[PDB]
Design a protein around this nucleic acid. Structure first.
Ligand code: MG
Ligand code: MG
Ligand code: MG
Ligand code: MG
Ligand code: MG
Ligand code: MG
Ligand code: MG
Ligand code: MG
Ligand code: MG
Ligand code: MG
Ligand code: MG
Ligand code: ZN
Lengths: 176, 216, 37, 144
RNA sequence: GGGAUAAGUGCUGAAAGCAUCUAAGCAUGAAGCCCCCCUCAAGAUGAGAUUUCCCAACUUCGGUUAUAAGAUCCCUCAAAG
RNA sequence: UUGGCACCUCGAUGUCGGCUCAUCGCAUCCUGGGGCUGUAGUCGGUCCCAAGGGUUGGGCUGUUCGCCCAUUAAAGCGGUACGCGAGCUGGGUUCAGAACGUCGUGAGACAGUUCGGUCCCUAUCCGUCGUGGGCGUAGGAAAUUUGAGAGGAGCUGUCCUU
């Protein structure tokens, strides 16, 4: 597992501390704690961390890769954070902030309210660009996915909520 | 959530604010007293036990249920109440809002309250499948010798038996029935009566239990 | 989704995967989505 | 010449044991407990009388399964009413009634005889770490 | 209305530097499943719980006794049959 | 399903259709949830999950089928001795009468037709629906109860507004 073998750089402002399997990373933006695979060892260097698997079995290789990726994600999340940007397409499709919660008006007979979660921030720009900011890459992805699933992009005019870089397949509509 | 016990007096009608004819059942609910308070600590669940309709005091050679026996008299005297004809528990109320020995007046309910009413339905005795289970008759003519019989009770070798739940002649009525979402049309505190919209199970003089409707 | 015993690439972009014990084909072309069954 | 000893109620001594389900496999713990209940571990074993001991099983909620039995082992029962099949997975039953899980596992390993029913009545199962039978002064028993 | 799910939909994610809903992990998702609603139910022989009532004489001193609380016989009845 | 075989039943295992009462499977007719679409929308097509419930009256014919009229969200397909005659019917069909066509010298005959034509049984056991008595539940009693389990229910139209 090349991903597992790869070493994780720790920014000076980020501190990683292990408690058996459980690990916790603190940084400027917040704190992230989780339990990693119990069979993976950690070489905790002063400026870097390395993940070591005990064997070369299938399970060990897979878990080595995933453990390294998750720990790197935690470190980069505390350091730089993660952001996902969605945009609204369609005339009248708008978004706005009701304090911390996000209210969307997308072609339904009712507005849709999305309640903000801990460690997550919503920001609306131009009434048509929502962005979710957090330290948890997983949480950011999950909430962006929920916002998109309120009304995902349709193929005939591209209307709905999409990730800003998302490619939307398009189909011709009416034909003779 | 509220509860009270009464006797079914009979049905009548009242004219509503727009002149609509409202069928009503008159329920006399005097002499309700909280006899016991059951709790999770002592009993494992919360409920108030209510006793309804004073009966006579204990006497030596009593021959009917009109006179309280010694166990019942002691039970009621513990609540400082006269012994009661009917005793039922309400689990749907907040026990902390009641005191043992307290009266439960018809005024606990107010007009417009939606209620569930429980009683024992009228008995019909031994009844056949047409009446008891609402089955269809056979032909009354065209040579038929099948009028009110219950019809086939099974199939054949498979299964060489009658399944449980087969509907057959037997005793009819006299079952506990709850009618949901009736309404309190009126409360008459002078007469200790509640006018309930519609009809409720049981014969006249039958015991009925009124509770705040469970569905909301 | 195509549900059939014969699951296999239909174009060069089709990708054979295994999810929850089931052989599947995923593709950029939705017509090519397959699930063995 | 007939000389085989026969146990009877005058000379049978039934002791009380406690067995900890925690970290134990359902079936393996169950077979060993069943032997104990039947008295198969006594030199005075006598088939027509109960020479077994009493068993308390604690931490039933921490009994464990192998494979995918948690979601795939299904317990079926029938109410003797048409279409009256009801089912519950081993995992759900462990969550909601671990005592019943262990009891049924063990009792399925005892004979369906009057004596087997009686012997199965000597089992007491508890989901947690406590039991109410200190008065019987049970001894810890090590499996295997 | 709640919990867990099906077909599905995804998030994060390696095995396989990419990709990937899946392996670990995390969501979501049916008139269906378990409940919520109604009825029966401790012969549930695993026979459960709470409140109240009765409580002595005689004994070959193991035990017995008619009585207690209570319930019936018989009788007047119906909302019950 | 049409058959093949001839293994249970010829000191009898009543046979079509209907009626009454259902019950189960799911390969789903409607309703619920989904993928793909040569899915603009309204409609559809096809496939997947799903058996909770629901799934109509009439004309003709013994009919089952089937066609037709009028509805419906829909008018599912199958098993249960082609479920059910000690529950009903008895129109068809394979007893005796009579007749036509036909065949036969004839007596008669025909998976040709026609008119008529005896459906017994007081439930012992299991099973099922109701309803009592005994004993048990470590004193004898009156009331109130928990809920292990079990049963019930579970369907859908149309219109207004957006
Ligand atoms: Mg009829
Ligand atoms: Mg007649
Ligand atoms: Mg092919
Ligand atoms: Mg014979
Ligand atoms: Mg299917
Ligand atoms: Mg006519
Ligand atoms: Mg038949
Ligand atoms: Mg028959
Ligand atoms: Mg005839
Ligand atoms: Mg003739
Ligand atoms: Mg001739
Ligand atoms: Zn392709």
């Amino acid at each position: 597992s090349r991903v597992g073998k790869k070493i994780i750089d720790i920014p000076s402002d980020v501190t990683v501390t292990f408690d058996g399997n459980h690990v916790t990373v603190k940084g400027p933006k917040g704190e992230l704690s989780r339990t990693l695979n119990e069979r993976m060892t950690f070489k905790q260097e002063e400026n870097t961390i390395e993940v070591v698997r005990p064997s070369d079995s299938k399970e060990d290789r897979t878990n080595h890769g995933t453990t390294r990726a998750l720990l790197n994600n935690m470190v980069q999340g505390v350091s730089q954070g993660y952001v996902k940007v969605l945009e609204l397409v369609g005339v009248g499709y708008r978004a706005q902030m009701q304090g911390k919660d996000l209210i969307l008006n997308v072609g339904y007979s009712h507005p849709v309210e999305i309640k903000a979660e801990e460690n997550i921030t919503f920001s609306v720009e131009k009434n048509t660009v929502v962005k979710v900011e957090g330290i948890s890459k997983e949480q950011v992805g999950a909430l962006a996915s929920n916002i998109r699933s309120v009304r995902p992009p349709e193929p005939y005019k591209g209307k709905g909520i999409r990730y800003q870089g998302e490619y939307v397949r398009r189909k011709e509509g009416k034909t003779g | 959530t509220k509860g009270i016990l009464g006797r079914k007096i009979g049905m009548t009608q009242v004219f509503g604010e727009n002149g609509e004819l409202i069928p009503v059942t008159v329920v006399e609910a005097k002499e309700n007293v909280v006899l016991q308070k059951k709790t999770v600590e002592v009993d494992g669940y919360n409920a108030i036990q209510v006793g309804f309709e004073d009966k006579k005091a204990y006497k030596k050679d009593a021959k009917s249920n009109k006179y309280a026996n010694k166990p019942a008299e002691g039970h009621a005297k513990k609540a400082d109440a006269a012994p009661k004809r009917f005793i039922r528990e309400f689990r749907n109320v907040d026990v902390d809002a009641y005191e043992v020995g307290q009266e439960v007046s018809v005024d606990t309910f107010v007009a417009g309250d939606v209620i569930d009413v429980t009683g024992v339905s009228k008995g019909k005795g031994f009844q056949g499948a047409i009446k008891r289970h609402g089955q269809s008759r056979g032909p009354m003519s065209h040579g038929s010798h099948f009028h009110r019989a219950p019809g086939s009770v099974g199939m054949a070798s498979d299964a060489s038996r009658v399944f449980k739940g087969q509907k057959m002649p037997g005793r009819m009525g006299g079952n506990t029935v709850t009618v949901q979402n009736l309404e309190v049309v009126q409360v008459d505190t002078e007469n200790k009566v509640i006018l309930v919209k519609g009809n409720v199970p049981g014969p006249k003089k039958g015991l009925v239990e009124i509770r705040t409707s469970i569905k909301k | 989704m195509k549900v059939r015993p014969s699951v296999k690439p239909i174009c060069e972009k089709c990708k054979v995967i295994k999810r929850k014990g089931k052989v599947m084909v995923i593709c950029e072309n939705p017509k090519h989505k397959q699930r063995q069954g | 010449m007939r000389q085989t000893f026969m146990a009877n109620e005058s000379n049978i001594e039934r002791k009380w044991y406690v067995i900890d389900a925690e970290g134990q496999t359902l079936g393996r713990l169950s077979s060993e407990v069943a032997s104990i209940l039947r008295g198969k571990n006594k030199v005075t074993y006598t088939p027509h009388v109960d020479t077994g001991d009493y068993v308390i099983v604690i931490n039933a909620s921490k009994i464990e399964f192998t494979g995918n039995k948690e979601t795939d082992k299904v317990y079926y029962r029938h109410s003797n009413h048409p279409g009256g099949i009801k089912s519950i997975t081993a995992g759900e039953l462990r969550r909601t009634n671990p005592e019943r899980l262990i009891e049924n596992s063990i009792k399925g390993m005892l004979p369906s005889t009057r004596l087997g029913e009686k012997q199965g009545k000597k089992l007491f199962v508890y989901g947690g770490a406590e039991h109410p039978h200190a008065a019987q002064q049970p001894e810890n028993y090590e499996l295997r």
